[PDB]
Amino acid sequence: YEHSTVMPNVVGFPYKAHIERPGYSPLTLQMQVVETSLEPTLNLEYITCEYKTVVPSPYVKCCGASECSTKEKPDYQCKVYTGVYPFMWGGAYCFCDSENTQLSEAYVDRSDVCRHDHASAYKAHTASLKAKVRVMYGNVNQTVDVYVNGDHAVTIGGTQFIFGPLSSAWTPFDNKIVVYKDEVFNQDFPPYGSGQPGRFGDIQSRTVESNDLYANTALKLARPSPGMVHVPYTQTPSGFKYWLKEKGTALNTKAPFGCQIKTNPVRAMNCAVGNIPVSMNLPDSAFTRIVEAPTIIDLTCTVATCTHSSDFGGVLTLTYKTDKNGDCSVHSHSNVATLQEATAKVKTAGKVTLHFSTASASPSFVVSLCSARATCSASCEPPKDHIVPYAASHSNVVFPDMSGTALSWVQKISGGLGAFAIGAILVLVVVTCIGLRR
Amino acid sequence: APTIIDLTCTVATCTHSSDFGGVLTLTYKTDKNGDCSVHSHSNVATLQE
Numbered sequence: 001y002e003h004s005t006v007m008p009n010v011v012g013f014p015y016k017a018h019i020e021r022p023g024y025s026p027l028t029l030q031m032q033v034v035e036t037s038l039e040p041t042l043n044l045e046y047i048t049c050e051y052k053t054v055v056p057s058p059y060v061k062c063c064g065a066s067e068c069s070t071k072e073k074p075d076y077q078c079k080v081y082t083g084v085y086p087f088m089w090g091g092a093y094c095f096c097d098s099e100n101t102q103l104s105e106a107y108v109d110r111s112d113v114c115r116h117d118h119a120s121a122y123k124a125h126t127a128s129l130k131a132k133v134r135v136m137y138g139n140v141n142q143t144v145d146v147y148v149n150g151d152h153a154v155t156i157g158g159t160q161f162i163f164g165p166l167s168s169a170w171t172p173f174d175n176k177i178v179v180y181k182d183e184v185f186n187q188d189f190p191p192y193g194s195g196q197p198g199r200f201g202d203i204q205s206r207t208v209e210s211n212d213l214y215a216n217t218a219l220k221l222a223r224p225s226p227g228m229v230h231v232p233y234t235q236t237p238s239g240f241k242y243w244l245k246e247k248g249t250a251l252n253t254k255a256p257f258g259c260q261i262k263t264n265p266v267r268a269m270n271c272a273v274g275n276i277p278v279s280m281n282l283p284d285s286a287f288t289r290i291v292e293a294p295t296i297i298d299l300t301c302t303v304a305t306c307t308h309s310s311d312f313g314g315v316l317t318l319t320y321k322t323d324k325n326g327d328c329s330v331h332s333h334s335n336v337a338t339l340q341e342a343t344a345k346v347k348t349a350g351k352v353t354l355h356f357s358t359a360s361a362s363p364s365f366v367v368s369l370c371s372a373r374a375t376c377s378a379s380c381e382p383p384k385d386h387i388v389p390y391a392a393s394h395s396n397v398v399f400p401d402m403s404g405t406a407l408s409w410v411q412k413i414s415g416g417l418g419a420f421a422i423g424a425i426l427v428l429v430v431v432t433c434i435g436l437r438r
Numbered sequence: 439a440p441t442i443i444d445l446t447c448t449v450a451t452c453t454h455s456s457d458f459g460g461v462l463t464l465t466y467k468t469d470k471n472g473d474c475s476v477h478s479h480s481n482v483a484t485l486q487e
């Protein structure tokens with residue numbers, strides 16, 4: 001039997017779906033989204049880490065000159081200085097007074113622990129959504145894992161479920177992401193091959209295991225001081241370390257809608273928004289024949305106490321008449337009130353009680369027990385407690401019924417004003433028609 | 439706590455003496471037997487229990 005429903009996407013919400021086959025007993029289903037997962041699709045841009053400056057020992061040619069040679073190294077630097085007179089611990093070599101040459105060589109290479117400590121740059125698009133939902137009815141429990149799109153059907157005791165696409169398509173990740181260890185950022189990194197010294201991505205490699213590298217650190221060499229062999233250089237500090245020191249904020253501590261961010265793989269967890277459509281196919285054995293179920297006649301509803309609090313804060317009493325004792329599938333036909341239970345035990349005494357939760361001053365809804373139906377209305381008083389540690393269990397609808405106290409007063413005032421206005425209309429029409437009849 | 443609906447009050451006898459001199463009857467309809475905390479919302483009458 002085909003059926004369709006929509007449920008809110010909030011973890012822990014006790015959604016109840018009511019299926020009414022005319023030839024059988026009504027059935028009620030309890031669904032609860034235990035877990036969610038927002039998985040974006042990622043493609044690597046590059047890897048970044050600290051650098052290491054490699055400075056080979058200077059080459060001094062005594063009594064001669066040497067000519068600088070170029071090589072293919074990342075940020076390579078080569079220079080020659082003339083007029084050097086080196087010194088050592090025992091005495092100065094290069095016996096010639098002033099015909100000596102020092103050759104300085106330097107270049108930048110990826111650090112040793114880049115494979116253990118590095119940041120990655122990513123692009124994100126077309127996020128997919130995965131879910132884990134617990135379903136209960138009759139005498140079957142159980143949780144299942146599904147992919148939320150119209151292409152995944154899971155069987156649970158002979159029943160086919162399909163959870164259709166999400167209503168919205170909102171994901172906290174922008175186009176470009178910076179991932180570091182266990183934290184995600186909404187950053188705009190510069191593209192490959194155009195880094196800037198002193199900031200993020202001064203050195204960049206395509207992958208962790210690729211040999212190639214692009215570095216840009218403004219390495220400059222200086223003339224050595226007289227009587228020393230020390231090849232002095234200057235270089236802007238590593239951009240990676242200053243990014244660590246001043247990255248600023250995060251996404252773990254700023255994602256909207258209250259949802260966690262995790263890594264490996266990057267995902268957003270328990271992130272409540274929108275609606276999940278559900279399509280259902282139930283076998284003939286799931287229902288119960290109308291002859292087996294007890295019959296209910298003369299069903300009346302009353303409210304003992306109401307209080308629009310977060311928990312289940314109203315108690316309702318149903319009076320009826322039955323032929324035999326058994327089980328009924330109670331339901332509420334409005335989202336103004338959410339029941340606690342889906343099944344009830346009817347006994348020949350004829351009284352049952354239920355608990356419900358709502359958030360309106362004047363609720364009004366139709367409750368059904370087995371095959372019967374009745375109307376319930378109530379007045380509710382505010383709760384006194386200011387803050388609670390459990391989430392609200394109502395659908396958060398506030399507008400009162402038209403028969404509530406405030407709307408009744410408004411309706412009476414409007415009726416009085418309208419009657420007075422219509423009386424004045426009649427006076428004017430009568431006078432003018434007397435004028436015209438003459 | 440039990441639910442209480444259809445509460446009606448009747449007074450059998452009254453006598454404004456110093457001792458507890460009025461007997462009152464309440465009729466209701468309840469789902470299960472239990473305990474309630476009775477009170478009077480005015481100081482004209484003082485309950486016993």
Ligand SMILES: *[C@@H]1O[C@H](CO)[C@@H](O[C@@H]2O[C@H](CO)[C@@H](O[C@@H]3O[C@H](CO)[C@@H](O)[C@H](O)[C@@H]3O)[C@H](O)[C@H]2NC(C)=O)[C@H](O)[C@H]1NC(C)=O
Pocket residue numbers: 063064095096099
């Ligand atoms: C041992 O030490 C002597 C100096 O005490 C070294 O002699 C020096 O040799 C170099 C090249 O062998 C000379 O450089 C060039 O010499 C030519 C000579 O025509 C000159 O035209 C160039 O402008 C340049 O100076 C250097 O002058 C010379 N020093 C002198 C003559 O005082 C010698 O090389 C050392 N031994 C070895 C094996 O190198």
Ligand SMILES: *[C@@H]1O[C@H](CO)[C@@H](O[C@@H]2O[C@H](CO)[C@@H](O[C@@H]3O[C@H](CO)[C@@H](O)[C@H](O)[C@@H]3O)[C@H](O)[C@H]2NC(C)=O)[C@H](O)[C@H]1NC(C)=O
Pocket residue numbers: 136141142
């Ligand atoms: C359908 O299955 C779920 C999962 O087993 C049932 O929920 C489980 O209910 C039991 C009984 O209440 C829980 O055991 C108790 O949990 C409390 C929680 O603090 C603990 O203090 C006790 O020591 C005891 O272990 C169990 O934790 C709970 N599990 C989950 C994941 O919710 C559920 O009741 C089943 N449905 C029906 C109708 O029985």
